[PDB]
Amino acid sequence: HSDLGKKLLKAARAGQDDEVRILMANGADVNATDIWDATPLHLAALIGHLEIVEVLLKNGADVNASDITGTTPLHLAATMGHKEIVEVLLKYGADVNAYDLNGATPLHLAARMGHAEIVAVLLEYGADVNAQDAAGMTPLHLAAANGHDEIVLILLLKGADVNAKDAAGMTPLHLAAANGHKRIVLVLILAGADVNAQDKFGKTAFDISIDNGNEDLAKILQ
């Protein structure tokens, strides 16, 4: 019955491992969906309950289920930074290169939110390092923008295009300079960033560093 599925969706979201097992022991649909088409595996991965995630997977959960926004359980585990849940989803066959309606992959969200270990394991399971979202942003764009130094090095070492341009013609050097991340600018420059590249406005990372008022980045970019 659908009620057992609704109770299962509530039990998984509430982190009640015993109630989850009781409901499925009574025939609850493990792939039950709410009005957002989110399965209990979505909610278990969102709240970081590794136990329920493993129980749902052991009972046949659709590991690649997608909700109406295009997000999958691995998207949620990667954004929230749940390392162990990311691993078990991946080895169950979760698609590391699935993208939501933003065009963002779990590597985008992990690189944006600064989850270094998850960035590594996603790449280790074959994540496209140069994936572009709907805005042309790549994981390096997001990591350089949000000041995640180690992730920038990890992405670059695994073949990230340092001179990648998004829908506005901005490189990671543009975003890093716009947010004042000095050492990331140094790393990008070292990795071969085109310092003379200008966005759709015609501004380089230097022109941004002057408009920002940062003398240090202005002296570096020249």
């Binding site: 509430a14 926004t69 709907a134």
Partner: protein
């Protein structure tokens, strides 16, 4: 006003995140900040009640950063239960998806009404205060007292106060010294989670000679 201070403290803790908190356990405000441009939809579900919408408010802040926020009505602000949140763009693309508990994000106002008084014996000071105004569960609010001294001394004492006690006795004070006292508040565990309030307005005393 006082809300801007708390929002700034949380934004530095989690940039690019959807931050929720409660000041007095009778409401809930979730907010985030992003770059420049109803293009967003805030929907929430609370303990087997139908998915409702929340009116998002938009205001600029800092260097062209736009802050969107939703204050859930007082009817849907019950604590100790899961509350699921979804921010979705107009295109149906995702933006945020979280599951929070209302009681786990309490950011109290600072305690008020400080009164510091010298004891009848030299070196001791009796400090009293009031809970954060218009806040329930005052029996569950724990405090911390800070004692600072002039001339570069900085903070010389930090004393944690029990739940529901709004009184503090301080000793070991140097004579002929201007001491300054402040207290902050926090919701005790395990029933409530959160961080310390801002420090109260201070009161000062010049200790006698001994």
């Amino acid at each position: 006003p006082k809300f801007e201070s708390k929002a700034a403290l949380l934004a530095a803790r989690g940039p690019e995140e959807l931050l929720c908190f409660t000041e007095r356990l009778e409401d809930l405000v979730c907010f985030w900040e992003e770059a420049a441009s109803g293009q967003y939809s805030f929907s929430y579900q609370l303990e087997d009640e139908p998915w409702k919408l929340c009116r998002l408010h938009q205001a600029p802040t800092a260097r062209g950063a736009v802050r969107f926020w939703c204050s859930l009505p007082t009817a849907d602000t019950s604590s100790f239960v899961p509350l699921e949140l979804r921010v979705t763009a107009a295109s149906g693309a995702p933006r945020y998806h979280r599951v929070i508990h209302i009681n786990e994000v309490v950011l109290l106002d600072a305690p008020v009404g400080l009164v510091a008084r010298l004891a009848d014996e030299s070196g001791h000071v009796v400090l009293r205060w009031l809970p954060p105004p218009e806040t329930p569960m005052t029996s569950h609010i724990r405090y911390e007292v800070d004692v600072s001294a002039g001339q570069g001394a900085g903070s010389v004492q930090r004393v944690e106060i029990l739940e529901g006690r709004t009184e503090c006795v301080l000793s070991n004070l140097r004579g002929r010294t201007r001491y300054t006292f402040a207290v902050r508040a926090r919701m005790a565990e395990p029933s409530f989670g959160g961080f310390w309030s801002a420090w109260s307005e201070p009161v000062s005393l010049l200790t006698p000679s001994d």
